[PDB]
């Protein structure tokens, strides 16, 4: 005997401050791979609709959430890594994809979760000015770990000889700039990419689109949704003091039991609504049909 939920409570964060996404893709100068930037987007609504309007991305892949669900979802911390690479390196930015040269510069965590974005920078980064200010490390005595950037530039002791300051045969300079060309072939155009690390750890969600905050209701099991927590149970205040940190709770069966609301700082107690079991006590149908 399963009681279906009545309505669909939704409770997303309060404000509707647009997230500064126009200065992520559409920006002037993108630092090279040997030193990329960290863009911490914090406590804002991010309407991905314009990120569906602004649709000029050549390659778009993510390994965590799906873009179908990116709209009706939330995140707690977001970080973006904007830079530029070769035309043949746009396929190298993928978790576990061992780069012939793309591990020295930028590696992706195999545990990644978030959508990477790439689009052709031929009209902005390939000009007559040579644009040799785009650089990338070519070799190093060790391969980097995913979210670490070796912005250092030292001499390389190739051939096992101390080439202290001098660049000679097998003493090369690692930070070799990009051999870009204004309006070169397809394989060699400068590609402008940007990743997004959606930290989906269960913490108070900040960066997500707006959805209709419906008023709380007690003792009525409803198809609620707290930042993706699509639970369908009754609601009540919880006696036990929740944590001043994250808004989510757990139990032995990893099915949330008590939460705290995004907007109001009131404690909630979740419980799947009345569940029992029918048992059709029947005499033989050859004798009746009443059960």
């Amino acid at each position: 005997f399963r009681v279906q939920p009545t309505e669909s409570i939704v409770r997303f964060p309060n404000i509707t401050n647009l997230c500064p996404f126009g200065e992520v893709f559409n920006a002037t100068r993108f630092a090279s791979v040997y030193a990329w930037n960290r863009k911490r987007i914090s406590n804002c609504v991010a309407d991905y609709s314009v990120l569906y309007n602004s649709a000029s991305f050549s390659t778009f892949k993510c390994y965590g959430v799906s873009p179908t669900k990116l709209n009706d979802l939330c995140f707690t911390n977001v970080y973006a890594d904007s830079f530029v690479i070769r035309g043949d390196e746009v396929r190298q930015i993928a978790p576990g994809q061992t780069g012939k040269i793309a591990d020295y510069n930028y590696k992706l965590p195999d545990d990644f979760t978030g959508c990477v974005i790439a689009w052709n920078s031929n009209n902005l980064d390939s000009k007559v000015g040579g644009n040799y200010n785009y650089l990338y490390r070519l070799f190093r005595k060790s391969n980097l770990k995913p979210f670490e950037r070796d912005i250092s530039t030292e001499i390389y002791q190739a051939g096992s000889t101390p080439c202290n300051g001098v660049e000679g045969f097998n003493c090369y300079f690692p930070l070799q700039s990009y051999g870009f060309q204004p309006t070169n072939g397809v394989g060699y155009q400068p590609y402008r990419v940007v990743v997004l690390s959606f930290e989906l750890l269960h913490a108070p969600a900040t960066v997500c689109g707006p959805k209709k905050s419906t008023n709380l209701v007690k003792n009525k099991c409803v198809n609620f949704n707290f930042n993706g927590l699509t639970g369908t149970g009754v609601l009540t205040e919880s006696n036990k003091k929740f944590l001043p940190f994250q808004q989510f709770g757990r139990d032995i069966a990893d099915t949330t039991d008590a939460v705290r609301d995004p907007q109001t700082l009131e404690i909630l107690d979740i419980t799947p609504c009345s569940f029992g079991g029918v048992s059709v006590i029947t005499p033989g149908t050859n004798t009746s049909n009443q059960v």
């Binding site: 965590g64 959430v65 799906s66 179908t68 669900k69 979802l73 989906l200 993706g228 927590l229 699509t230 639970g231 032995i252 069966a253 990893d254 099915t255």
Partner: protein, 48 residues
């Protein structure tokens, strides 16, 4: 018997390979053709 039942519950808190352990946090992340494989993992595990 009580301990058998008590160890049957704690199998709901097992990833079994999937990127979560609860079926509301797989359909709130992935899409049908891509969440179906995760749920296939979880369901063959829980059925086992």
């Amino acid at each position: 018997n009580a301990q058998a039942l008590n160890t049957l519950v704690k199998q709901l808190s097992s990833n079994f390979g999937a990127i979560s352990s609860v079926l509301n946090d797989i359909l709130s992340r992935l899409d049908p053709p891509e969440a179906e494989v995760q749920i296939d993992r979880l369901i063959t595990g829980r059925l086992q």
